[PDB]
Target: Major tail sheath protein
Amino acid sequence: AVEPFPRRPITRPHASIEVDTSGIGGSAGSSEKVFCLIGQAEGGEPNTVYELRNYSQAKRLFRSGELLDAIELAWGSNPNYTAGRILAMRIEDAEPPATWADKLDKFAHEGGYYIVPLSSKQSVHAEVASFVKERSDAGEPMRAIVGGGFNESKEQLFGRQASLSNPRVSLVANSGTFVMDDGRKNHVPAYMVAVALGGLASGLEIGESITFKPLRVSSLDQIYESIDLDELNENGIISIEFVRNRTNTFFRIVDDVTTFNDKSDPVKAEMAVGEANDFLVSELKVQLEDQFIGTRTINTSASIIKDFIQSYLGRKKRDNEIQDFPAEDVQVIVEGNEARISMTVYPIRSFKKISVSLVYKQQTLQA
Amino acid sequence: RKKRDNFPAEDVQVIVEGNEARISMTVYPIRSFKKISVSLVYKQQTLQA
Amino acid sequence: AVEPFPRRPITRPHASIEVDTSGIGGSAGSSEKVFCLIGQAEGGEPNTVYELRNYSQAKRLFRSGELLDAIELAWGSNPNYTAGRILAMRIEATWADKLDKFAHEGGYYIVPLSSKQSVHAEVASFVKERSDAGEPMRAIVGGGFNESKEQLFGRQASLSNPRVSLVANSGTFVMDDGRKNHVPAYMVAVALGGLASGLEIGESITFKPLRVSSLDQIYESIDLDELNENGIISIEFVRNRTNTFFRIVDDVTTFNDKSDPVKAEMAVGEANDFLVSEDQFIGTRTINTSASIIKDFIQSYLGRKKRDNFPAEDVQVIVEGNEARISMTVYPIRSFKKISVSLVYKQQTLQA
Amino acid sequence: DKSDPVKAEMAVGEANDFLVSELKVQLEDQFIGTRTINTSASIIKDFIQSYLGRKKRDNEIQDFPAEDVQVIVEGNEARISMTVYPIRSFKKISVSLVYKQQTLQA
Model:
């Protein structure tokens, strides 16, 4: 803005100052991913959302229940990365709830992106799928991560992935044994592994894949063979590989394939680039809206909007949230009611194939 | 000549009537944006080293 | 399609983003040439098509039978090539009702593990019924343990079809258990089908080696020519070297015709089954036209394009009923069957 | 078949096997799942040249022409090309020995 000093005008001879702050006013940084959990628990009032920052704070707001273990796994499984905020909600009817759709809505305008329901029921999975679709269509992009029960055959997994083929749901096959800060080792259903994967994905930078990131678990109940893992990957089911040929044995997340059945478009198939797309569109929308709508269509606006877009995309390039963009494709056309804007973006892709061609050749040494 | 020192032929209208000629220019006032339309195209690029 | 963001339309003042994803879509490439087998086994659930990915899985599902020996040969003839997927089905008589099950399993070569000519005719009929549909297929078949040339000719004539090949020879394969397994010629056909599945799209099995220990019959050059000209595949014992080996003479087909490569030679038929095929200005821009000026215009256009990036003798134009069809010739990649060397002895004056 | 040394000779097949195995395992753990940053092709080229430098140091290859190391990154994948001169044991020596006269004067 620009402001007069004094604010009240003066008629008689005087000096007055007009001051412009746009050059020092800040700007919104890169948005933050926040992780959402819905859980059976003991503790605080049900059906309200708590922002949580510390395990101690969580262990005061909640006690002795699977939600608190889920929060523990969510922070503990990503040691290398900054521990983000978590949004958590106990659920009980004011007895077991018949439906969660009535409660999921209380997340709707929270600043939250990844959802995990702490239950195995396919109906709950469908409910959260519908909710994530709803909010995305409303313009609040979200994703869900989903998992089975304690132990499931490939047949059951394929059945579930049939029941939910969706670009905003991911299914986690493996269930395993974790080790807890309480000095406890517990067998858990696969959705707790999905909690771990959501913690890692929400910790990672925007547009960074969970594929081939390590996972920390005491054991897995199902150790899938190479053909088994290829089968599940073809079906768009996330699987955990036990690395055995290395001297050190550890568990990899094999891939970040969504449950969606068509692999031809990566923006729908792969979580990372879909997330990058979601954040890029959301930030473009909200920033252009608050920047320009209602402003006067002064003759130079065709410059100013191009300069704004080029600045924004330069900032996106700086953070490695896009690969590159052509500056000259940023083009603006102004008509009396409307700004019409064109841009090209090169998005950032994770490496998923490396092909080495090795040519043996002779050289004649001589002396 | 004036705009060289300092208008589109498509934007001036002339009517002559009764020894009088009315010359009417179009002019463009300053409005305010109500709509922004962004077309976002994802290309891809070969890097090489 | 172009995606609107938000998905919901809005009329109050707002921004909307339209996303063109179409510049990134992929996976548009071909299928691999999955291989198909039908025959006897123990253990497997009959008339169920199983995908198989390694021999251990095969021995886990199928056991103790000729289908597993076939799967062994199918990956043993081509050790220096990719060991791709195989589709296999235990069959516990009509075979069409079983062959129907392969109809929507995406595999290109099939071999029945039987020498019975009724079976071969059924398989040829199935290959026809599939390939005249949107999903091309081929089959390979063989005789028994020893059949005469006149029997092989009679069989080929009865089974004369542009998508079936007959292999004449039979022999012995060393199995990975060390067994000297004597096998009928249709297992050699399995071995050739495995090789052909392993080779690239429009590579050819002619002059590829066969890793076989011995052959029941060795054909001299005149007999190899006789079988080749009749469209029967035969295996040569290469004797001209201390490093003797067995060589697939040719990829001929039981339909033999000099006038069309695509039906005579299996590899070019496969290329045609897998090849891929690849601007308008409208007469209102001109008062009248003819095929002559259409040809000269399109020649000037493609001359400009080929300068930036076609022979006038190689474009045909027909105009009919307000429509002009412009037909280019194009040249596909074949494979050499003949090399002709003219060697001229000159002599030279040296001087010093 | 003596024609191919990678088949005929144990030492060459061994060197090949360890070369391709350590390439696969290290490119896997170094780069798979990493973002295609605009510099990624240069980083991979440096990594490959480092690896082959080590293999040369240890006398596990004869040499590599470092100019032939080429990397192309295109969307979801990298294609890498390299030339390697393999290490080989001597298995023949031929000496051609020519007698010549010399005139000595004093």
Notes: Chain B has one helix and four strands. The interface with chain C takes residues 33-44 of chain B (CB under 8 Å). The helical segments of chain B are 2-5. Strands of chain B lie at 12-17, 20-25, 35-42, 46-48.
